[PDB]
UniProtKB/Swiss-Prot annotation, chains A, B:
Chain's role: Catalyzes the reductive methylation of 2'-deoxyuridine-5'-monophosphate (dUMP) to 2'-deoxythymidine-5'-monophosphate (dTMP) while utilizing 5,10-methylenetetrahydrofolate (mTHF) as the methyl donor and reductant in the reaction, yielding dihydrofolate (DHF) as a by-product. This enzymatic reaction provides an intracellular de novo source of dTMP, an essential precursor for DNA biosynthesis.
Quaternary structure note: Homodimer.
Originating species: Bacillus subtilis (strain 168)
GO biological process: one example: methylation
Official protein name in the record: Thymidylate synthase 1
CDD domains: TS_Pyrimidine_HMase
Length: 278, 278
């Protein structure tokens, strides 16, 4: 399957055929020097996997544990409170916390709203999805959406991976996800691994085998100063994918904890430091 | 960039590798005899066009005028009233008409909700998008969304082609659209033409040239009794694409009317009758 091979192909396309945003007055700067941080981009890319391997990069280490913590905060706890994430030892969302400690009506807040009728009760997007995957498998509407048009102005940030659609065919659960934009050096490897974990989780609790995993990206971009590191990274040895052990005893989506996941035999290349933009 | 070529490739893939829904207790049946109407399907397909020609089939006639009428009702009038569509002489939505004459809070209703703050006024998704394409071209969030999670239960039908993402690069306006599901025989040709017309309208009024046009589909299906006719279509002669004249004098999106569009030199194959699935 291999994520290293697909990722390298998309990166080489951006480097070779990407379009620069030098024409625009960009709002991002390099923190080492205050100069404008420009990117090269391409539109509409897709990565697809058969699930014979965990989609994880071996040419650099992906921060797999943090990826799963963030997934749990959004999908399982359905929280918009950065303090819950701090308690899991995660600090990457601190910059976005509002005066009240939350990120607004974004991400987990959207997955927690009880806005769907089911069995005469009001349930959220997640519980609705869980029920429908088991009881109405052939549905052409198994979708979750974080891009709520009525609440965009109340979000501290708008989500990048904002939707999923699921399909059940012949006992297999297929997942397709979309990101409206992705920084290919820093965000993409993290997001691709993270949603595959979500697919393995839900398939386990709904009773299905793993189908295909498809990850779509609208604006694929890489910052110009990251290009040197990406070129090094593309010449590195690629290892065999590691195994992801997920505790077999978990039967309920809300019972999973960070200790129920383990990556076995994860070999990867040395650390590359990427200049910060923001 | 014949759409005929790309369409025929997808259809062949479905006929050959498609998966049957015979395993499920389908709720659709054939009009002629009441038996269950099953389908073959494939997941996640994509068509891309460079806009050098109008994406329209020539192996059968597409209902181009009706497609533009429904587009204006949803995007320009932003109406959920079937009576408005009947006045333009269109009846394909009558079956979904609720007792108040509307389709609930779907389609046009979502595009007309004043939910975004802009310059001291509350504006809807379409005016917000028009403003942003001109004033914040480089945005990674030029998205419209009809899949509003808070209102799915208030919709008489959930939309098939439910989202768009727009990109502005080097003076060109690219459009990416997604359908969660598409009946490939009856719905896809109509939907693919209809959204390209929207691209041309919007580019004309915002002052950009035409970029790429991408159409993504999640569950791609064809009803089994439609197969023979599709096999016929595939062996038919293909003609050059017609030119689409759009009135050069319209400067405001809200000024376009049906008489501002004319297809010229549209040659296509003879009529094929497809069995109705209720």
């Amino acid at each position: 399957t291999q994520f290293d091979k697909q990722y390298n192909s998309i990166i080489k396309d951006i480097i070779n055929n990407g379009i620069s945003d030098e024409e625009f007055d960009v709002r991002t700067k390099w923190d080492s020097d205050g100069t404008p941080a420009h990117t090269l981009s391409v539109i509409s890319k897709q990565m697809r996997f058969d699930n014979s391997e965990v989609p994880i990069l071996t040419t650099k280490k992906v921060a797999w544990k943090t990826a799963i913590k963030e997934l749990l905060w959004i999908w399982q706890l359905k929280s918009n409170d950065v303090n819950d994430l701090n308690m899991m030892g995660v600090h990457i969302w601190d910059q976005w916390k509002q005066e009240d400690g939350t990120i607004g009506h974004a991400y987990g807040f959207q997955l927690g709203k009880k806005n769907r009728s089911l069995n005469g009760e009001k349930v959220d997007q997640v519980d609705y999805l869980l029920h429908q995957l088991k009881n109405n498998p052939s549905s052409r509407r198994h979708i979750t959406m974080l891009w709520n048009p009525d609440e965009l102005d109340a979000m501290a940030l708008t989500p990048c991976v904002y939707e999923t659609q699921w399909y059940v065919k012949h006992g297999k659960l297929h997942l397709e996800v979309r990101a409206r934009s992705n920084d290919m050096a820093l965000g993409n490897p993290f997001n691709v691994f993270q949603y595959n974990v979500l697919q393995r989780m839900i398939a386990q609790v709904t009773g299905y085998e793993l189908g295909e995993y498809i990850f779509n990206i609208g604006d694929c971009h890489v910052y110009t100063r990251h290009i040197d590191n990406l070129k090094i990274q593309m010449e590195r040895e690629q290892f065999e994918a590691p195994e992801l052990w997920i505790n077999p005893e978990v039967k309920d989506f809300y019972d999973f904890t960070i200790d129920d996941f383990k990556l076995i035999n994860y070999k990867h290349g040395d650390k590359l430091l990427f200049e910060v933009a923001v």
